[PDB]
């Protein structure tokens, strides 16, 4: 399957792969967050072991994997991503064109 079990702690929550946009760290929150298309979901995870999940899933930044299949444009200058959902992130200067 492309499952993937975010675990919070007593509980996890089994989403898709392509149910996510992106995981991002954040500074407000020991665990991590996967932007769904309608919602976010804390878990606890780490995004390297994320983006080595998936060929989709790429980390951009570092605080952010992105899912490529849910990426709709890629603004190079401001190295902005725009995912499908209206949703974007950031991409450092390294990556931006790597994605």
């Given at each position: 399957v492309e499952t993937i079990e975010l675990k919070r702690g007593?509980?996890?929550?089994?989403?898709?792969?392509?149910?996510?946009?992106?995981?991002?760290s954040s500074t407000k929150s020991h665990r991590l967050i996967a932007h769904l298309d309608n919602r976010q979901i804390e878990f606890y995870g780490n995004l390297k072991e994320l983006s080595q999940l998936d060929d989709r899933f790429f980390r951009?930044?570092?605080?952010?994997?992105?899912?490529?299949?849910?990426?709709?444009?890629?603004?190079?200058?401001?190295?902005?991503?725009?995912?499908?959902?209206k949703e974007h992130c950031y991409a450092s200067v390294r990556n931006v064109k790597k994605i």
């Amino acid at each position: 399957v492309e499952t993937i079990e975010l675990k919070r702690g007593s509980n996890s929550v089994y989403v898709q792969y392509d149910d996510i946009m992106f995981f991002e760290s954040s500074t407000k929150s020991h665990r991590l967050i996967a932007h769904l298309d309608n919602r976010q979901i804390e878990f606890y995870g780490n995004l390297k072991e994320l983006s080595q999940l998936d060929d989709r899933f790429f980390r951009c930044h570092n605080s952010f994997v992105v899912n490529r299949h849910n990426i709709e444009s890629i603004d190079s200058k401001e190295r902005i991503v725009y995912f499908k959902n209206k949703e974007h992130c950031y991409a450092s200067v390294r990556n931006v064109k790597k994605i």
